[PDB]
UniProtKB/Swiss-Prot annotation, chain C:
Location(s) in or outside the cell: Cytoplasm
SMART domains, alphabetized: UreE_N
Annotated keywords: Chaperone, Cytoplasm, Nickel, Nickel insertion, Virulence
An example Gene Ontology molecular-function term: nickel cation binding
Family: Belongs to the UreE family.
Keyword Cytoplasm found: yes
UniProt xrefs under InterPro entries: UreE, UreE_C_dom, UreE_N, UreE_N_sf
Transmembrane regions: none
BP-aspect Gene Ontology terms: protein folding; protein-containing complex assembly; urea metabolic process
Protein name: Urease accessory protein UreE
Primary location: cytoplasm
Pfam families: UreE_C, UreE_N
CDD domains (UniProt xref): UreE (cd00571)
Length: 147, 148, 149, 149
């Protein structure tokens, strides 16, 4: 039974280590209790004291024994990447998506946003003519807008 | 039966005219068909060809006979005035309010937004520590965020 | 200041009484405090102890002095009347309207339901091909499906 | 190589008779048109779907069939609130209310039965209204879903 993050590989960790990833979809990162089969057969239970409120992030270190590591890998998904032109537009989009109850993530740049691809959201985004592309891509839990 | 905006007093019109106002609440600006009793007793019927989608605005000229005018006043209401500090914060507010299905309007400056007062909306805005004030004020339909 | 329902004219009351109605839209039925001008000039203030949770209903007797009565009238409104085939269909309708966050009322019969007319709601009801008709009609607050948020 | 059509469903027996390799899906995964899978017995399978049944892949949809060698869809079980409504009024209430929550909703085995994923608020609600329900580890067939259009 895993209890706490031993932090995240991002704090290198230039491996250096054999790393056995657990593979999560973006929406799975928030369970406190769940059972997993890691990439290399292994078994892993989790119960979380202080599960970072926004969820598990990329490479969160679940387990660490010697150089033997287990970390969180977040699977890629179809993602509508949104490029708003102005602050007025950001507001429009967010409100409108919020109204849709779809999920929404901050993008890499200041007017960029990412949301799971769904066709109604897509339809919406064109109806208001915002500039967007669908890419298979990663959605970091730490990028999510709470709600 | 009134049919047409003869425009809006904002295009002066330095009155100049005895103006009898019809007094609408903000949520009332969007009927196409309804009946009214103006400020000074009179009676008005409306059916709208091209009712500006966003609804009736402040001083939309309903009726114009000589210097005798009837127009739309919009009554003040309790309003939460929201002042976002960042574009990050804008996004968060709008998403969260949209997620609540509350109404939202653009503010006077760039990170200002106005939403009707409701206690849950307020509760929300504190929970996120956004800086806001409740003021009795006017909501322009021209200032609203759609939902399409 | 009016305080209690003295009931409702439905408990006849075959008038018998000069009745002066107060006219409320279906969404207004739930203020505990507000002021009114009745149908024949009169003025009424309200403050409610035990405002029946769902709101004021049709002909809720506000005021009763002799045979002189004031009651609640509920402005008839545009209403989609829904006639469901089967329980399955009921469940589909209710879930889908619920999902829309529209308002919903029990009809007269078992598979009848009433909801305010909105064009997307109608659109929807055709998209599923449910049988309905729009009528101008009353929406009794006692007939509402509640909600908890 | 790539799978294109359902060759139907085992339900149309098929009293196996066959060695059947299943593909194991969660109930939310039944609606991808393009994805890659490793079957129960290691095999590899890609899908692209013309006329993917709108509501999703169902229990035992035959992806692949070569001789007596078969690949079918299995839907993994999950925690499931099983709801047993006493009346048609109560169905409507439940569905509208859940609809309003935006929870997922499936037709049960019997007429007044409905199944929705387990979540604690959905539970919370269901008691608040005093509906009779039980949580059970079980299967949510995609064909049993209440749309939303
Ligand atoms: Cu909603």
């Amino acid at each position: 039974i895993i209890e706490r993050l031993v932090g995240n590989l991002r704090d290198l960790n230039p491996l250096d280590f054999s790393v056995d990833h657990v593979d999560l979809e973006w929406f799975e990162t928030r369970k406190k209790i769940a059972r997993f089969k890691t990439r290399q057969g292994k078994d892993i239970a989790i119960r979380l004291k202080d599960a970072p409120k926004l969820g598990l992030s990329q490479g969160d270190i679940l387990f660490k024994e010697e150089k033997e590591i287990i970390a969180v890998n977040i699977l890629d998904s179809e993602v509508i990447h949104i490029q708003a032109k102005s602050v007025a537009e950001v507001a429009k989009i967010c409100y409108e998506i919020g109204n849709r109850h779809a999920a929404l993530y901050y993008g890499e740049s200041q007017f960029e946003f990412k949301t799971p691809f769904e066709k109604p959201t897509l339809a919406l985004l064109e109806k208001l003519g915002v500039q967007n592309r669908v890419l298979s891509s990663k959605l970091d839990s730490k990028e999510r807008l709470t709600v």
